[PDB]
Amino acid sequence: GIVEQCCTSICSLYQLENYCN
Amino acid sequence: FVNQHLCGSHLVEALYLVCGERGFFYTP
Amino acid sequence: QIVLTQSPAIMSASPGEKVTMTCSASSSVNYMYWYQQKPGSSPRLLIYDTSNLASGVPVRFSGSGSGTSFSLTISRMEAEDAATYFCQQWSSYPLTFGAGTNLELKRADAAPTVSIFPPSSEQLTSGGASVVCFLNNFYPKDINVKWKIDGSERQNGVLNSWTDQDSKDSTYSMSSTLTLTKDEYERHNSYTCEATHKTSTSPIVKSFNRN
Amino acid sequence: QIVLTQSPAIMSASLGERVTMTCTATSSVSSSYFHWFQQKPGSSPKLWIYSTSNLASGVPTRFSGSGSGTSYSLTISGMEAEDAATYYCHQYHRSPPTFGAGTKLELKRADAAPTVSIFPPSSEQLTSGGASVVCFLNNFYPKDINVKWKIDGSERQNGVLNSWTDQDSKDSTYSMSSTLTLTKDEYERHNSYTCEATHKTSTSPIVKSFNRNEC
Amino acid sequence: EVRLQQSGPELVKPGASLKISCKASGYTFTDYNIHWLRQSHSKSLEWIGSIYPYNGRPGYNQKFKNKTTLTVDNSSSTAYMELRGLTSDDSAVYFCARSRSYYNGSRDYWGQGTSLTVSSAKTTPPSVYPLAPSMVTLGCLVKGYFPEPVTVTWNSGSLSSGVHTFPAVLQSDLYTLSSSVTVPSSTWPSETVTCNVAHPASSTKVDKKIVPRD
Amino acid sequence: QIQLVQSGPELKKPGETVKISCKASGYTFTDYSMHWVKQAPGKGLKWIGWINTETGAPTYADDFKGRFALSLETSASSAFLQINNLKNEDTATYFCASGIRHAMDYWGQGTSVTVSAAKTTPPSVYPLAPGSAAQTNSMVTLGCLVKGYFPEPVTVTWNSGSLSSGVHTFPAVLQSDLYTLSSSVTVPSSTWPSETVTCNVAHPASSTKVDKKIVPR
């Protein structure tokens, strides 16, 4: 809501793999 | 998703594609 | 896995009231969607990501909610807003939808026009006999039909088919068809079509005898 | 990956004039990911205009951004002295973010002729084993200038080092020094060393020379 | 303008297979996901799965993972969904949906719908039976026909006000519906009132005049 | 308040490795990302990469993949840029940019590294005077050449700062792993060589402070 990261900037494929469980 | 701004539910769409059946977390 | 329980399933409102629906989830949901579907049309997006309004939709629609409870609110009810409204979560996969909230427009109560019809001779010669009982133009949609054969009630062979709310008088119509064979139809004499409605404490009865 | 082509790379304007620069991309760019940065010599770049037309907290209202798709522009209503800097356009889309070539905004003034001064290498440097010929070009406008080093009539290009100064805060003039560094052996093989300066202020190039045949 | 075009209505037999297309236009087909949905009864929406047209990687729901295959065509900018082992429980209307636009996107896009019907029945013409007992309400019985739908008119369309054609019902692997009409008592039986039904699947155009009984 | 402080200037040799820092303050460092932009000497701006402060996963541009790494420190709320096998083309100013509301908002300082044959050498100062038979006008121009010093900078004053006007100190130019700077002064003919004119150069890196007197001929 008050904070976002991959929305302001652009996350690559490797940065999305770091959000996985 | 190739170099795009993932805002809101768009973040959930890509994390389901990248992580696949492994699950993910984004909030908080 | 998340179960979306919409409440109420059916609700009425006159063109001018303030409509408020609710969609609850089994677990915590971050982003919630809202769709509007009319019979014969694709669902139109109304609210995406819990509170963001879509394009083309009038500003009278508003979405709210957080965590496990959500809601869709219409400021001023309009005539074109009569449809079914669904809720859909996009927080966790797989994507799940709600049960749906059918929104009908409110009008004055009306008594159903009960009309029973004996099976035609062209159908009897073919080897069957179906008794059709019409219930045209009534309000609300809640109604009951009981088939009584020679005083005894029967439930097997009864087929019901309701129509959508009319676009002009906003009245409902339902047809109850009791399908019997020629032998079973000729074994009795009195056939009664009972109709129980809220508009009258006495059920409207229409009968006929094969004299 | 999309290339931001700023035009003009260098431009001058007097006080009160309407300055307008342009930034052009190779593909379509959304207005939410186009910005403008103002950088002054000796300072970090600052966000001047974000989201095409929104001014930052601190920018004067004389600045205004516009544009859509592939063409954008930054416009200054009344040019002021503090608006002299370099302006970059920024993007954010299908590829790592790209920056513009930059538009160096300078203050406009009357043209001035450079004060040419050639200097022979000092005797203290010759004893050390080197010989550098320094030629000064002080106070001229615009910054565009040409320097030709002629040794015994023949021009030489190797060993020339040029250094321009920023636009002055008082007279708004430029200054540059051209130094031709040679060794003691190469310097003693010739006699006349001329520093030719071609400028817009005169069709005849200003020449300053010296000869080792003296006393 | 982003438009998603699907295939026409499909009627197949149980146990067979079928593939459904979804043509896209008005946007970069490779960038946005393509979701597939199933509309069974008028008040249910089940998410089948998604697919990324860039590399063709799909994501299936565990309920439909066994009997659904999502393919894609980058050249024709078309998404496809093939269903195997179709039963009567799979007879529904299927939709293909595109996600909303990025950042400033406040509009998604849904297809026009693909009506799927799994039934082993054959084409059967409808059997018409007249229904007769201030305002006298009549009727017209349409029983035993396949497949859907069927249009019903009264007096070739001149009797339009006060009619109620009811939805069909699955009666013994066949469809059956009724249509009512309310005309003044001075019109019937003083004038001719005829119900006209038309089954285009069997080229059946049968008219039945309503006469009083004894 | 929002403030980004970078590490001091760095001095490295070709092939070495430098690691600069960028400390954030006035906001939640882990909630907003951090970017890095390089600026060649007097050239344009070039993007390097950015770090996911919520996680730590970094990315880099095509021209910076390999020899460029990006780390963090949640305890100190700072980011780090490390360059491996420094080349002569790596001599530039490296900026760290934040990203609270928009991409690369609120920058900070800027660390400039110099990749060259490090050798703290004192500056060689040579006086510049007109020739013995040079023409004498109303204003005579004197100079003072500073050649072969490393690293930056050098402070040049004329007559202990009393000569302020007519001074034009040009920026240094790095060539052959050494800096070279020149300065000129314009004085009336009635003041030189009648009055002594000296150029005072200072190189605090080598603790060198010279006073060169401009003698005619």
Side-chain angles (χ1 to χ4, degrees):
Chain A
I2 77 162
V3 53
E4 66 274 17
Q5 217 157 82
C6 294
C7 166
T8 319
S9 36
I10 283 176
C11 289
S12 99
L13 202 162
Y14 166 69
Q15 323 195 237
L16 305 182
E17 308 182 332
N18 286 259
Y19 270 106
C20 310
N21 266 321
Chain B
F1 303 110
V2 178
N3 214 57
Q4 289 276 357
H5 292 262
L6 271 41
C7 305
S9 70
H10 285 132
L11 195 62
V12 194
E13 278 181 67
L15 288 170
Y16 175 73
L17 162 74
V18 161
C19 317
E21 292 302 313
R22 297 182 271 167
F24 51 88
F25 56 94
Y26 63 104
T27 302
Chain C
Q1 287 324 100
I2 308 178
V3 181
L4 300 181
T5 298
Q6 278 182 252
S7 48
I10 180 67
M11 70 185 295
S12 318
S14 40
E17 293 182 60
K18 180 187 185 169
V19 181
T20 304
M21 326 170 220
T22 304
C23 163
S24 155
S26 68
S27 67
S28 175
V29 166
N30 294 318
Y31 308 123
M32 184 61 74
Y33 282 59
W34 290 91
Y35 288 75
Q36 177 206 84
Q37 189 183 33
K38 297 193 174 174
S41 95
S42 300
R44 193 185 51 151
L45 175 55
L46 258 49
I47 294 284
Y48 63 99
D49 284 336
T50 301
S51 63
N52 294 101
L53 256 176
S55 72
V57 299
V59 289
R60 59 177 177 263
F61 293 102
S62 162
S64 173
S66 66
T68 191
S69 62
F70 299 84
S71 68
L72 178 76
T73 313
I74 314 173
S75 66
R76 304 315 302 285
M77 170 57 177
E78 299 284 342
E80 68 169 277
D81 294 332
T84 83
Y85 297 81
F86 307 93
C87 72
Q88 179 233 324
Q89 60 93 23
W90 219 312
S91 164
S92 273
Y93 274 74
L95 263 40
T96 55
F97 280 77
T101 294
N102 197 338
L103 210 166
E104 91 176 343
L105 74 96
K106 197 139 57 190
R107 52 145 292 140
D109 294 343
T113 301
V114 185
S115 300
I116 190 166
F117 294 87
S120 62
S121 62
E122 285 96 349
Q123 180 181 13
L124 293 148
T125 44
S126 90
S130 309
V131 200
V132 176
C133 188
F134 286 147
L135 298 92
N136 290 345
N137 305 98
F138 60 95
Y139 192 90
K141 201 180 162 191
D142 306 284
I143 205 173
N144 189 326
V145 173
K146 293 215 159 200
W147 278 94
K148 276 188 171 185
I149 297 179
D150 276 344
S152 209
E153 192 187 326
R154 161 74 87 93
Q155 296 197 174
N156 298 335
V158 179
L159 257 50
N160 301 335
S161 176
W162 306 261
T163 54
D164 290 335
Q165 183 160 45
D166 194 79
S167 62
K168 302 173 203 163
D169 51 0
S170 301
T171 65
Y172 289 94
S173 298
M174 146 193 194
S175 82
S176 191
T177 310
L178 173 64
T179 298
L180 256 53
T181 71
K182 180 159 105 86
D183 282 332
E184 300 169 312
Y185 171 64
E186 288 171 347
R187 282 196 217 113
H188 295 91
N189 185 241
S190 167
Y191 288 98
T192 290
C193 172
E194 293 203 347
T196 314
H197 203 258
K198 97 181 294 290
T199 191
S200 172
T201 45
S202 52
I204 312 194
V205 172
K206 275 286 201 291
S207 295
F208 73 98
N209 307 297
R210 38 188 286 252
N211 53 333
Chain D
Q1 188 78 302
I2 56 149
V3 179
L4 285 315
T5 305
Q6 268 174 252
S7 61
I10 324 283
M11 67 179 306
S12 64
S14 295
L15 293 179
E17 298 183 356
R18 183 186 191 76
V19 187
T20 301
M21 44 200 68
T22 318
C23 180
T24 296
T26 64
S27 300
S28 190
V29 182
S30 175
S31 58
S32 297
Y33 309 108
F34 195 95
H35 316 301
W36 293 91
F37 288 95
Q38 177 204 64
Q39 174 170 48
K40 314 204 105 171
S43 301
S44 92
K46 292 162 55 186
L47 177 61
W48 219 231
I49 293 181
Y50 64 93
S51 295
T52 299
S53 60
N54 304 100
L55 269 59
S57 177
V59 186
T61 64
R62 73 178 79 105
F63 290 86
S64 72
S66 175
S68 66
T70 66
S71 182
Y72 297 83
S73 65
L74 188 140
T75 301
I76 317 176
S77 65
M79 169 78 182
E80 288 302 318
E82 59 177 50
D83 299 340
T86 308
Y87 295 82
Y88 297 97
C89 51
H90 179 224
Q91 71 100 8
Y92 224 99
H93 257 274
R94 328 187 264 106
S95 148
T98 322
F99 260 98
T103 293
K104 177 153 165 72
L105 187 57
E106 309 280 275
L107 210 63
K108 186 141 164 305
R109 53 142 296 141
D111 297 335
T115 305
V116 198
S117 316
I118 188 170
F119 290 81
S122 73
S123 63
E124 310 176 10
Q125 178 184 42
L126 269 294
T127 60
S128 68
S132 296
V133 194
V134 179
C135 179
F136 290 131
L137 279 305
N138 278 342
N139 307 112
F140 60 94
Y141 191 90
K143 197 177 181 175
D144 314 284
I145 202 171
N146 188 286
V147 171
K148 299 176 184 179
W149 281 97
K150 294 179 176 173
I151 306 179
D152 267 348
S154 301
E155 194 181 310
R156 173 155 179 164
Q157 302 180 3
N158 166 256
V160 173
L161 272 186
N162 311 322
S163 183
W164 280 264
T165 44
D166 299 318
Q167 178 166 46
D168 195 73
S169 62
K170 294 304 149 284
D171 47 51
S172 299
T173 62
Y174 301 97
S175 297
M176 74 140 293
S177 65
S178 183
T179 307
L180 170 56
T181 297
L182 305 178
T183 182
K184 189 173 185 179
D185 207 274
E186 287 174 304
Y187 181 69
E188 278 171 39
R189 297 173 205 163
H190 301 285
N191 173 40
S192 66
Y193 289 79
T194 84
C195 165
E196 185 174 302
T198 296
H199 198 266
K200 173 189 175 179
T201 44
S202 182
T203 62
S204 300
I206 317 172
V207 49
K208 283 299 178 67
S209 175
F210 73 94
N211 300 332
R212 312 211 293 121
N213 317 142
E214 214 65 60
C215 50
Chain E
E1 191 205 356
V2 174
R3 303 255 314 185
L4 288 176
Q5 203 78 20
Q6 303 192 243
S7 49
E10 288 276 350
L11 164 67
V12 75
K13 298 179 185 276
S17 189
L18 178 72
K19 193 184 278 178
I20 295 302
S21 60
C22 168
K23 278 153 90 136
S25 56
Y27 75 105
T28 300
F29 182 65
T30 285
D31 288 351
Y32 286 88
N33 264 133
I34 293 287
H35 318 284
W36 285 92
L37 299 104
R38 157 208 258 190
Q39 178 85 83
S40 286
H41 82 105
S42 192
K43 220 158 155 164
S44 74
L45 271 197
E46 295 181 293
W47 170 72
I48 292 162
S50 299
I51 177 163
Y52 193 30
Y54 172 64
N55 46 28
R57 162 145 283 152
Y60 294 88
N61 196 347
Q62 294 178 335
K63 174 166 176 175
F64 311 98
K65 178 161 185 44
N66 182 32
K67 295 195 298 137
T68 305
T69 299
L70 298 177
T71 58
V72 84
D73 190 359
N74 303 346
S75 94
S76 74
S77 296
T78 316
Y80 297 80
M81 175 179 76
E82 172 195 300
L83 304 174
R84 307 170 277 108
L86 284 166
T87 85
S88 62
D89 290 2
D90 301 316
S91 297
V93 166
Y94 296 86
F95 293 99
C96 66
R98 201 219 84 174
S99 312
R100 60 189 196 84
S101 296
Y102 296 113
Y103 195 75
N104 54 359
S106 57
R107 162 173 302 173
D108 56 359
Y109 306 92
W110 286 56
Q112 84 273 23
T114 324
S115 183
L116 206 161
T117 302
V118 174
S119 163
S120 49
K122 53 142 181 60
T123 310
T124 310
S127 293
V128 191
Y129 303 127
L131 265 43
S134 181
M135 296 302 293
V136 189
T137 293
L138 312 168
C140 200
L141 179 58
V142 183
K143 184 163 182 299
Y145 72 98
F146 186 83
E148 278 243 55
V150 55
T151 187
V152 183
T153 57
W154 289 94
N155 274 2
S156 315
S158 58
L159 261 45
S160 41
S161 63
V163 300
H164 291 283
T165 297
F166 301 97
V169 280
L170 214 49
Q171 190 190 162
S172 287
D173 298 294
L174 294 175
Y175 288 105
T176 293
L177 58 88
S178 280
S179 175
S180 81
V181 61
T182 316
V183 291
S185 53
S186 68
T187 312
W188 186 83
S190 43
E191 292 165 89
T192 297
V193 183
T194 318
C195 50
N196 331 100
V197 301
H199 195 231
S202 65
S203 303
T204 289
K205 185 65 201 187
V206 167
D207 294 344
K208 202 74 52 171
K209 186 185 171 193
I210 318 294
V211 299
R213 65 192 300 122
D214 302 85
Chain F
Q1 265 261 298
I2 290 164
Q3 157 173 71
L4 257 46
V5 172
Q6 284 200 229
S7 47
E10 303 276 358
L11 211 180
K12 303 299 170 183
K13 289 189 175 65
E16 289 181 356
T17 287
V18 64
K19 187 173 179 181
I20 55 189
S21 65
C22 164
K23 173 126 181 165
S25 72
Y27 72 101
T28 303
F29 174 69
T30 53
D31 274 339
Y32 304 106
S33 67
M34 190 60 82
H35 284 59
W36 296 90
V37 177
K38 143 171 151 184
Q39 214 205 337
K43 301 307 295 168
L45 285 153
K46 302 94 166 156
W47 193 66
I48 306 173
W50 78 278
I51 319 166
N52 186 291
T53 44
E54 276 270 4
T55 324
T59 49
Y60 321 95
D62 293 351
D63 286 353
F64 296 80
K65 277 172 186 175
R67 324 193 294 101
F68 293 89
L70 280 183
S71 80
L72 317 86
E73 172 89 339
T74 314
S75 66
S77 297
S78 60
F80 303 87
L81 208 173
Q82 173 176 314
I83 313 177
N84 304 330
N85 291 337
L86 288 152
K87 326 288 191 194
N88 271 320
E89 78 196 322
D90 287 328
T91 295
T93 306
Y94 297 108
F95 289 101
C96 73
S98 198
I100 324 292
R101 208 157 100 203
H102 273 330
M104 323 205 202
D105 188 39
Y106 312 120
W107 294 47
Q109 285 240 300
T111 301
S112 68
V113 313
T114 72
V115 177
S116 194
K119 199 42 176 31
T120 310
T121 166
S124 285
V125 173
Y126 310 126
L128 295 180
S132 61
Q135 195 93 78
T136 295
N137 211 337
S138 162
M139 293 288 275
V140 52
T141 294
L142 307 182
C144 194
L145 187 65
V146 180
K147 187 175 181 57
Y149 73 97
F150 193 91
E152 280 262 64
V154 280
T155 51
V156 169
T157 70
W158 283 90
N159 272 357
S160 295
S162 56
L163 272 184
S164 55
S165 63
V167 185
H168 277 280
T169 294
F170 309 91
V173 173
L174 180 76
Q175 263 224 326
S176 298
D177 306 78
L178 292 173
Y179 289 109
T180 299
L181 167 138
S182 58
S183 184
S184 83
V185 280
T186 314
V187 292
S189 297
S190 59
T191 59
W192 187 78
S194 51
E195 293 161 58
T196 81
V197 172
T198 57
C199 50
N200 322 118
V201 192
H203 187 215
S206 64
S207 301
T208 307
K209 179 183 183 293
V210 307
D211 301 307
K212 189 56 64 183
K213 184 175 179 177
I214 311 300
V215 155
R217 171 162 267 184

